[PDB]
Design an enzyme around this catalytic site. Sequence first.
Site, short mmCIF file in Angstrom:
data_model
loop_
_atom_site.label_atom_id
_atom_site.label_comp_id
_atom_site.label_asym_id
_atom_site.label_seq_id
_atom_site.Cartn_x
_atom_site.Cartn_y
_atom_site.Cartn_z
N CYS A 67 31.08 36.40 47.85
CA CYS A 67 32.10 36.27 46.80
C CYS A 67 31.93 35.03 45.91
CB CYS A 67 33.51 36.29 47.38
SG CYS A 67 34.80 36.01 46.14
N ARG B 67 35.46 32.51 45.09
CA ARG B 67 36.10 31.79 46.19
C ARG B 67 36.87 30.49 45.86
NH1 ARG B 67 31.78 31.08 50.61
NH2 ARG B 67 30.21 31.84 49.10
N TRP C 92 40.81 39.66 40.50
CA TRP C 92 40.53 40.32 39.22
C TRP C 92 39.04 40.60 39.15
CZ3 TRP C 92 43.01 35.52 39.39
CH2 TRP C 92 42.16 34.41 39.30
N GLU D 7 30.78 43.38 36.64
CA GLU D 7 30.96 44.39 37.67
C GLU D 7 31.17 45.74 37.03
OE1 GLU D 7 33.35 43.34 41.22
OE2 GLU D 7 34.09 41.66 40.00
C1 HEM Z 1 40.02 36.25 42.00
C2 HEM Z 1 39.02 36.95 41.49
C3 HEM Z 1 37.82 37.36 42.25
C4 HEM Z 1 36.62 37.59 41.66
C5 HEM Z 1 36.39 37.45 40.19
C6 HEM Z 1 35.70 37.98 42.68
C7 HEM Z 1 34.37 38.29 42.41
C8 HEM Z 1 33.61 38.96 43.34
C9 HEM Z 1 32.46 39.71 43.02
C10 HEM Z 1 31.86 39.86 41.65
C11 HEM Z 1 31.97 40.22 44.17
C12 HEM Z 1 30.74 41.10 44.29
C13 HEM Z 1 31.26 42.55 44.24
C14 HEM Z 1 30.18 43.59 44.06
O1 HEM Z 1 29.06 43.32 43.55
O2 HEM Z 1 30.41 44.77 44.40
C15 HEM Z 1 32.83 39.82 45.21
C16 HEM Z 1 32.61 40.18 46.52
C17 HEM Z 1 33.57 39.92 47.47
N1 HEM Z 1 34.76 39.30 47.30
FE1 HEM Z 1 35.46 38.45 45.75
N2 HEM Z 1 36.31 38.00 43.87
C18 HEM Z 1 37.61 37.62 43.71
C19 HEM Z 1 38.63 37.52 44.66
C20 HEM Z 1 38.50 37.87 46.01
C21 HEM Z 1 39.54 37.98 46.95
C22 HEM Z 1 41.00 37.76 46.66
C23 HEM Z 1 38.96 38.32 48.17
C24 HEM Z 1 39.66 38.56 49.46
C25 HEM Z 1 40.74 37.88 49.87
C26 HEM Z 1 37.56 38.42 47.94
C27 HEM Z 1 36.60 38.74 48.89
C28 HEM Z 1 35.35 39.28 48.52
C29 HEM Z 1 34.50 39.96 49.51
C30 HEM Z 1 34.80 40.17 50.97
C31 HEM Z 1 33.40 40.37 48.87
C32 HEM Z 1 32.22 41.11 49.49
C33 HEM Z 1 32.35 42.63 49.39
C34 HEM Z 1 31.12 43.33 49.95
O3 HEM Z 1 30.41 42.80 50.84
O4 HEM Z 1 30.81 44.46 49.53
N3 HEM Z 1 37.32 38.13 46.63
N4 HEM Z 1 33.85 39.02 44.69
C1 LIG Z 2 31.73 49.13 44.93
C2 LIG Z 2 31.10 47.75 44.94
N1 LIG Z 2 31.80 46.77 45.81
C3 LIG Z 2 31.53 47.05 47.23
C4 LIG Z 2 30.07 47.43 47.45
C5 LIG Z 2 29.90 48.27 48.71
C6 LIG Z 2 30.74 48.12 49.80
C7 LIG Z 2 30.56 48.90 50.95
C8 LIG Z 2 29.54 49.85 51.01
N2 LIG Z 2 29.39 50.57 52.16
C9 LIG Z 2 29.00 51.85 52.32
N3 LIG Z 2 29.45 52.47 53.33
C10 LIG Z 2 28.05 52.58 51.41
C11 LIG Z 2 26.78 52.31 50.89
C12 LIG Z 2 26.30 53.34 50.06
C13 LIG Z 2 27.14 54.45 49.90
S1 LIG Z 2 28.57 54.13 50.83
C14 LIG Z 2 28.69 49.97 49.91
C15 LIG Z 2 28.87 49.20 48.77
C16 LIG Z 2 33.26 46.77 45.56
C17 LIG Z 2 33.84 45.37 45.53
C18 LIG Z 2 33.95 44.63 46.70
C19 LIG Z 2 34.48 43.34 46.66
C20 LIG Z 2 34.88 42.78 45.45
C21 LIG Z 2 34.80 43.52 44.27
N4 LIG Z 2 35.17 43.02 43.06
C22 LIG Z 2 36.28 42.32 42.83
N5 LIG Z 2 36.38 41.57 41.81
C23 LIG Z 2 37.37 42.44 43.84
C24 LIG Z 2 37.91 43.51 44.52
C25 LIG Z 2 38.86 43.09 45.43
C26 LIG Z 2 39.10 41.72 45.52
S2 LIG Z 2 38.04 40.95 44.38
C27 LIG Z 2 34.27 44.81 44.33
CL LIG Z 3 34.33 47.92 41.47
#
Ligand code: HEM
Ligand SMILES: CCN(CCc1ccc(NC(=N)c2cccs2)cc1)Cc1cccc(NC(=N)c2cccs2)c1
Ligand SMILES: [Cl-]
Lengths: 362, 362
Positions: B65, B68, B237, B242
């Site tokens: 993230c 953070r 947000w 994204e």
């Molecule tokens: C406040 C604005 C926030 C922005 C702009 C932001 C931005 C991002 C972005 C761009 C990603 C990559 C997502 C992707 O490529 O699919 C990400 C991943 C992540 N964010 Fe944040 N985030 C925010 C807030 C938060 C919050 C509130 C949480 C949880 C309390 C959080 C937890 C995570 C987690 C766990 C991931 C990893 C998801 C994964 O492994 O697929 N973020 N964040």
């Molecule tokens: C869709 C892209 N990602 C998650 C990526 C992802 C997660 C989990 C899987 N797992 C699977 N099981 C799969 C892989 C392929 C097909 S399904 C695959 C991809 C969504 C995401 C996650 C965390 C943050 C954000 N963006 C944001 N800005 C936020 C959302 C909520 C709080 S911040 C977007």
């Molecule tokens: Cl998304």
Amino acid sequence: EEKEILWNEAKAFIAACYQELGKAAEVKDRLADIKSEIDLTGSYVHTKEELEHGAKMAWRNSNRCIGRLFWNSLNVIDRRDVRTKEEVRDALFHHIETATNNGKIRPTITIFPPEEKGEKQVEIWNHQLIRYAGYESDGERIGDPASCSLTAACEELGWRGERTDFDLLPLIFRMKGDEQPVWYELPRSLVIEVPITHPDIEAFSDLELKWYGVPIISDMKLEVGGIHYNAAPFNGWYMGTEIGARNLADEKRYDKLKKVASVIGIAADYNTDLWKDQALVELNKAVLHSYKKQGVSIVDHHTAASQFKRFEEQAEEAGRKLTGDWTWLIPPISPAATHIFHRSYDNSIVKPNYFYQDKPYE
Amino acid sequence: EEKEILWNEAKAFIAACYQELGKAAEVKDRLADIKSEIDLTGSYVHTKEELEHGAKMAWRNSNRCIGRLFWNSLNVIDRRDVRTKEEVRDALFHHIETATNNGKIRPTITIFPPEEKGEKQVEIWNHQLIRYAGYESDGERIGDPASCSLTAACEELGWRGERTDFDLLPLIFRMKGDEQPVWYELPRSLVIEVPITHPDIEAFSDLELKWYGVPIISDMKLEVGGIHYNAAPFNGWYMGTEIGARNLADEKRYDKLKKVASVIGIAADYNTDLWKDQALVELNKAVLHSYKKQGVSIVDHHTAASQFKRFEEQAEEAGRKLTGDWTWLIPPISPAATHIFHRSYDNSIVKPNYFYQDKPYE
Ligand code: HEM
Ligand SMILES: CCN(CCc1ccc(NC(=N)c2cccs2)cc1)Cc1cccc(NC(=N)c2cccs2)c1
Ligand SMILES: [Cl-]
Ligand code: HEM
Ligand SMILES: CCN(CCc1ccc(NC(=N)c2cccs2)cc1)Cc1cccc(NC(=N)c2cccs2)c1
Ligand SMILES: C[C@H](O)[C@H](O)[C@H]1CNc2nc(N)[nH]c(=O)c2N1
Ligand SMILES: C[C@H](O)[C@H](O)[C@H]1CNc2nc(N)[nH]c(=O)c2N1
Ligand SMILES: [Cl-]
């Protein structure tokens, strides 16, 4: 332990190499000659074939290189015969000429004698054979910051740059037995350069940007079957992003984006305008256009990525494990637009290969 | 072994958490109550303070993230009290409302009862609370391919999408004791959406693109001191890239770049024209412009990167080790323009944290 490292490395390389060259039945005999030679001389000498294929293999194993598809067509020049600095200079001059090939760049490596007891025979100081100098004097920045230390070291040895933004550094290298390196100005007739213009935007030439045609890396160690060729300059052609997204764009390099933005007629005030991204794209388009217009080989990152996909496919087709460094393989602009971004790579080190080694100055 | 994992995790979390909250002297006593509770009940219940700070810590530890910096201001809603699907639905509806906050998005997490013996109390099927459906019927692609399987599973349960490119999926979740999940259509008055227009280029609206305002992730497990909150939807947000560089650009998603290129009046024929890169930039500018014009919170990748730099600085200032996943932290457009690209990060897993868990369908 030293002789043992060498012997282990040699067995592994000879077996693999001769397997690839259909020479598998010559391995046992060749390994014997090598083992005797090592026991007697502390080292061993590669055949022309071994050396050539080792160079190609080393390229194939370069995890960070996106251009590996063409590994097998590397043009190898064997200069293990050189003994004099005149001979080293002329071999370097020649490498520039034949690699450049009037713009139709030929991927080439020139291989000089290897280290003996870790003792270099020829020690090259240049990062690339063709590169621009850099000056940082109390606030006043000129040229390529990457070249600041090498430029200063060179200016110890009686050389003097003109302090334009594009001074060509001379060749600088040292021979075993000598305390100081020598330096030789490059004949300008050997160096092709490209003025950066933009296909649509006339004002872009106001920036007065240029770059050199051929990047020839001259500070990496080629390692082949336990033998260390510390001096083995190699070249390919450029991927456009290398110039447009890094060399001319980096704040720690030429730092041109704000000037690009101005000549392309956009504001450079707000992050949300994405002016940096927009400037990056126009500058990189300029680069590609300029090299093509000048008849100098170059590749865009989509085509490169596309070629590297074919390399991945070939490796699988040949039953060879593929290795790669994802962090370096992805291009610095639009990385998610390439397939590389969406898969992973094993970053294991396989030999033969090219390695970093300590700078002889600083 | 299970009770031991729980006890070890609890000691580590309570000590750290109470240290951060200046409550260090309450650790010994609190740990005792916990150990008794575990010995007696096989588990333990977090205080409101513990749960809140655990949620914040978990965000702070999310290596991938970039946002953070604002971890400590996470708004935590404690719904460990829910027992009924009506209560779950209403808690989800409410989360959408308060997080959205008329466009001024509030980073919020709603925490439902945790697993007991690895047995879920509430099992959410949605990837995000607000997401578009996807249909792949013999060659005919509609909507968001990412949602194809969930959409199909939902269409087993008696629901039917309209098959526009932007059908909102209903909430779908299952209660412990029930064999099938239930589903509830979202009240449209709760969902803010943004039409994508471009600041300069009038024709961009011909694409008829839109996206939802608030990404609320609802399929990750929050782990706090050995307790598994499998159901704990959270939102921030969007970072513009994204939507502009991935959701609308990916070939396996909405795949819009060729259409973007056409409405912005450039050819999509030659790799060397960098039309993809150019299309990417205009589309991403469109996204940022559209969200700002609509009064919906969003951040560009330069500002985000800039904020994440402050987070790196804060970690150092607080004596906290920083962890991160470089491959996910770099933005998919102009990554070398951010500082992230030019440094490395330790990708170690630290708890509390958010984790993937198996999909309940497919
Ligand atoms: C406040 C604005 C926030 C922005 C702009 C932001 C931005 C991002 C972005 C761009 C990603 C990559 C997502 C992707 O490529 O699919 C990400 C991943 C992540 N964010 Fe944040 N985030 C925010 C807030 C938060 C919050 C509130 C949480 C949880 C309390 C959080 C937890 C995570 C987690 C766990 C991931 C990893 C998801 C994964 O492994 O697929 N973020 N964040
Ligand atoms: C869709 C892209 N990602 C998650 C990526 C992802 C997660 C989990 C899987 N797992 C699977 N099981 C799969 C892989 C392929 C097909 S399904 C695959 C991809 C969504 C995401 C996650 C965390 C943050 C954000 N963006 C944001 N800005 C936020 C959302 C909520 C709080 S911040 C977007
Ligand atoms: Cl998304
Ligand atoms: C034919 C055209 C070639 C292209 C387009 C190409 C492209 C690239 C690019 C873009 C990089 C990353 C450079 C950087 O970011 O600084 C790279 C790295 C590398 N390439 Fe290639 N390459 C080519 C040919 C070659 C050849 C001929 C060799 C050697 C025989 C080679 C070996 C390497 C090595 C060793 C690296 C890593 C350098 C490092 O670690 O700093 N490549 N290549
Ligand atoms: C300048 C950027 N890289 C090398 C990056 C690099 C290498 C070595 C160091 N090592 C250091 N000692 C330093 C780090 C920081 C200051 S000095 C640092 C950076 C040059 C390079 C290497 C390999 C390929 C290319 N590009 C090319 N297309 C080719 C050149 C030759 C054959 S292909 C460019
Ligand atoms: C820290 C990071 O790994 C490093 O700075 C890399 C990222 N990837 C790169 N990739 C290439 N091709 N060239 C570079 O100089 C870098 N920098
Ligand atoms: C293989 C690669 O590591 C993977 O596909 C990642 C690359 N980095 C990413 N980074 C983000 N933010 N989101 C992603 O979906 C991906 N894909
Ligand atoms: Cl370079």
